[PDB]
Amino acid sequence: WTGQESLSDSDPEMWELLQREKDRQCRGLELIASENFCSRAALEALGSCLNNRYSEGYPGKRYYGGAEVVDEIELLCQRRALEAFDLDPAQWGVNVQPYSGSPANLAVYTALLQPHDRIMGLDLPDGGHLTISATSIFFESMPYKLNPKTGLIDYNQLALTARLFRPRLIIAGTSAYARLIDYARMREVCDEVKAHLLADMAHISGLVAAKVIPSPFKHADIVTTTTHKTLRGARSGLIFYRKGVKEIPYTFEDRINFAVFPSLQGGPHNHAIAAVAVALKQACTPMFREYSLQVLKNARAMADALLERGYSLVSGGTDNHLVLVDLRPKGLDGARAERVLELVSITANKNTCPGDRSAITPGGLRLGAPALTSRQFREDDFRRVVDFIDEGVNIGLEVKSKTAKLQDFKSFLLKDSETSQRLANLRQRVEQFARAFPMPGFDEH
Amino acid sequence: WTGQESLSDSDPEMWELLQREKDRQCRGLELIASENFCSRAALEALGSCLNNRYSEGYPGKRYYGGAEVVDEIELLCQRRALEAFDLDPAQWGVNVQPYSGSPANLAVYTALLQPHDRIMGLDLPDGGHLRISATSIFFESMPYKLNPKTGLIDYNQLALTARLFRPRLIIAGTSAYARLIDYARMREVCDEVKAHLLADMAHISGLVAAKVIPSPFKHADIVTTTTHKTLRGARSGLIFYRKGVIPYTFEDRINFAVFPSLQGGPHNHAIAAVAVALKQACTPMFREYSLQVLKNARAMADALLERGYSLVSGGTDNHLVLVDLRPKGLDGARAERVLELVSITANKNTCPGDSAITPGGLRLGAPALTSRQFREDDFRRVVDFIDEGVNIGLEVKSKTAKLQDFKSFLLKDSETSQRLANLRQRVEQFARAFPMPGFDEH
């Protein structure tokens, strides 16, 4: 055992699996949950010897051996994050250790709130498509809601209801929201009621960095994010925090750092920090701004094509990487569409429409442009992506007429021969279209 | 821009640093914190398109598109994990999503306890340096004790205080303890006081797989671990739990605590790397490696005993040895610093008789160097270099008063820095010649 023998030679079972995922990403239309195709350079650092370094604690104050290079990476990653978001290092700091998105938010909560302190966040922030929570368990949550008429945040009810609830922390964030969040309005409500504003910009950070949308940094105390959504890097988290005066100084740095370690996490994933750091250098470039504009252009193109075929869209359209389809008028629910699209190699997830209760089978569907725009899709290509989605939906409506239960519907897609061929036909064309485009990452895996 | 260009071309600055870490890993003696060197096959899964795959939820119940392949990698990793610890699928399940060890443990607390329920773990379970823990913040913790004279865990005193305190959960686990933990005895206590036994085998779990030390699964009903210490995999975490039988109710709650309570999407690249490594862990080869880790610890202990270093608890049954430097007249602060400057990695440790006192100890481990085909004679050779480091430490501790002055002296003094550079070069020669698991250059 050398320890240096390839994956394909030493573990065929797993290499066979790895290749199926690479083929699927290449052959399919990837529209799911603001995901992306990570670059080769970032991935190289992600699966590297940096995986082997213990480095509990923080750069500067690690006195045990070996953490000297890893210090310089962590400190580099910070500067590049502050650069990507055009932040004054005197006014802003950043903690690059959080293992993913949720651990980033959890570390902010435990840093600034006592157990049982009160938090407010948007109800069903990610769509509610998987029907307690950290927020709800160790602290006292109260949701604010979307306004069912407009599909936008009901900032009024949020302002009115927060005066009564008295939260110490309000979250400004939603991964299933196709419009721009009014951070200044959220800052009003927080200052009045005497609360921290946390901008969770998980799925839109690359857009914020490229300056194709308004920055929550101009208004938020704290900003959390992910690094694998619209930022195009590795799966990781970040926590940005203000520092300096306003002379009463901010006290975020030490509490936020102490919450990540030692309160919640162990030693950081230095492989992940380096892969993030690669992607953030990439994000600073003009190439990434031109990409981010194309993301918006493509999502708007997608939105228009759906509208032009008589689809309803939650909130009328988009200012965003996302477009939320409301399928209820068209006659299909989200679970049904979600499934049918999988079988023709199109990844989406269902989404709860504003107005509908928990027990209604979500009638919407969340789509997003980041992944495919990274494969050099233009507006024409997304217009043609919608042709494929619409055809898939029309198969669904045919099968809805011939079936009753969700389980009847689902079996009928596989077993009815006239349906399984129409799906196979749409799958073959979808796949003929998608393969032709380039793909970021490695050739083979 | 393709996103397909090499790291060295598109980011020379980062590539430089990456190779400095790889170089430092090859030329150094690496004894810190039970860390290891990950297989190339494992790191190839880690550097992969699996990074791109969203899959919040669990296999079989993920109805959004794209998850078909990742459903299989997750379930395969579970079977490969239950296989590696010789666990029957009817009696044991395993959750392979924890982002690391501390999330793996935190998920178990929230799964089983309410907030403010009572817990008991070992005081300073990791050691010294770097209401503190999240376990202290949300729950009501009262620590249990090492016996300050012997070095071992005070099982009698633990049972005394546990009768008073009425804990709901007890944590068996220390990443700074050179001994076997009497899991039978801890279950006897937890049965008596009606409490859950959690076994955090984080640092030792590779040894448990290879059957070279006794298994906590015999006596515990929840087991957490890491996958990058003795298991040699990528950085991650696991939660093993009972199922079957009057049935167990751990599966649903544990799963809910991981998602949606504490985590978002799983890291499927890391899960896939773990799965590569648990396959490696099921082989006779891995058992050779693990026996050699235990024997290289003893070989390291005995060479330190043979120069009259006191070791906490007399020695080791383990992958690591805990060196008491209070007799020798140096502290863990100065020791780890000198060793760092001659490419030897270790960390300071609190000795049983003392907290706010500079830790007069040292934690050294086999796993990493044993993975470079180090034998007993190579570890006695390691102790030679460590001993020369300690000696230089005493040489400087005489000449200088405070740590700020001490550390400055190691760089600024001409005669010391040359004797350092000389020792360093003899360590870097010795180590560079050994083989290294992983990629050639990064």
Swiss-Prot record, chain A:
Changing P440A: In NEDCASB; no effect on protein abundance; decreased glycine hydroxymethyltransferase activity; associated with altered mitochondrial redox metabolism. One of its GO terms (biological process) is regulation of mitochondrial translation. The modification N6-succinyllysine is found at K229. It is found in: Mitochondrion; Mitochondrion matrix, Mitochondrion nucleoid; Mitochondrion inner membrane; Cytoplasm. The modification Phosphoserine is found at S411. It is an enzyme of class 2 (transferase). One of its GO terms (cellular component) is mitochondrial matrix. Changing K415 to R/E: Does not affect succinylation level or hydroxymethyltransferase activity. The keyword Transit peptide applies. Its EC number is 2.1.2.1. The modification N6-(pyridoxal phosphate)lysine is found at K229. Its cofactor is pyridoxal 5'-phosphate. Succinylation at Lys-229 inhibits the hydroxymethyltransferase activity. Desuccinylation by SIRT5 restores the activity, leading to promote cell proliferation. Changing T135R: In NEDCASB; uncertain significance. Changing K405 to R/E: Does not affect succinylation level or hydroxymethyltransferase activity. Keywords: Acetylation, Cardiomyopathy, Cytoplasm, Disease variant, Intellectual disability, Membrane, Mitochondrion, Mitochondrion inner membrane, Mitochondrion nucleoid, Nucleus, One-carbon metabolism, Phosphoprotein, Pyridoxal phosphate, Transferase, Transit peptide. GO terms for molecular function: amino acid binding; chromatin binding; glycine hydroxymethyltransferase activity; identical protein binding; L-allo-threonine aldolase activity; pyridoxal phosphate binding. Pathway: One-carbon metabolism; tetrahydrofolate interconversion. The keyword Membrane applies. Its main location: mitochondrion. InterPro entries: PyrdxlP-dep_Trfase (IPR015424), PyrdxlP-dep_Trfase_major (IPR015421), PyrdxlP-dep_Trfase_small (IPR015422), Ser_HO-MeTrfase (IPR001085), Ser_HO-MeTrfase-like (IPR049943), Ser_HO-MeTrfase_PLP_BS (IPR019798), SHMT-like_dom (IPR039429). The modification N6-acetyllysine is found at K61, K145, K246, K297, K405, K410, K415. Belongs to the SHMT family. It is linked to Neurodevelopmental disorder with cardiomyopathy, spasticity, and brain abnormalities: An autosomal recessive neurodevelopmental disorder characterized by global developmental delay, moderate to severe intellectual disability, spastic paraparesis, ataxia, and/or peripheral neuropathy. Patients also exhibit dysmorphic features and congenital microcephaly. Most affected individuals develop progressive hypertrophic cardiomyopathy in childhood or have cardiac developmental anomalies. This is Serine hydroxymethyltransferase, mitochondrial. It comes from Homo sapiens (Human).
